[PDB]
Amino acid sequence: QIDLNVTCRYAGVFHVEKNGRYSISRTEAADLCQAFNSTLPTMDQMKLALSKGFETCRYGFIEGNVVIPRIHPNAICAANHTGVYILVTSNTSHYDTYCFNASAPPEEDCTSVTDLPNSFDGPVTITIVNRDGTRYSKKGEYRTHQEDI
Numbered sequence: 001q002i003d004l005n006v007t008c009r010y011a012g013v014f015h016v017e018k019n020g021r022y023s024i025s026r027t028e029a030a031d032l033c034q035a036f037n038s039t040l041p042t043m044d045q046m047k048l049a050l051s052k053g054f055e056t057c058r059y060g061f062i063e064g065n066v067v068i069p070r071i072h073p074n075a076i077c078a079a080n081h082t083g084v085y086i087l088v089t090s091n092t093s094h095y096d097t098y099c100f101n102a103s104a105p106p107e108e109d110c111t112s113v114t115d116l117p118n119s120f121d122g123p124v125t126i127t128i129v130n131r132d133g134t135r136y137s138k139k140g141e142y143r144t145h146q147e148d149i
């Protein structure tokens, strides 16, 4: 069983946390976004999402970097930084991910996610968990890299 906690989308960008812990590799992140018919955001896409109201308190992949978007300074989120905070030094490789859905609304979309449209056949139950607790479950797989399996 896999839980995927997702957020609001902001200019198409959203955050995905797997199994309540930093547990996604960069290869898995691309596959996971592909399951949402999405891609890893570019830094420009992320900056526009930030400008629409997106912030999290979790490291996640974008294309090329691991970041935390921050609007409001918080001492426990990205060392009190604002803007798209870029992780510079870390020993480790597993984070959450951001994803970008080009078909989402242009600004804040805080409706819930009710599908995992591009998952593959598989036996494991994947549950999308919204911030409001609503859930969408479907049996499937999204990982293509043997290293992640």
Ligand SMILES: CS(=O)(=O)Cc1nc2ccccc2[nH]1
Binding pocket: 001, 002, 019, 122, 124, 126, 140, 141, 142, 143
């Ligand atoms: C339980 S796990 O350590 O997150 C490995 C895993 N990740 C998956 C993603 C989709 C379907 C099955 C999956 N099994």
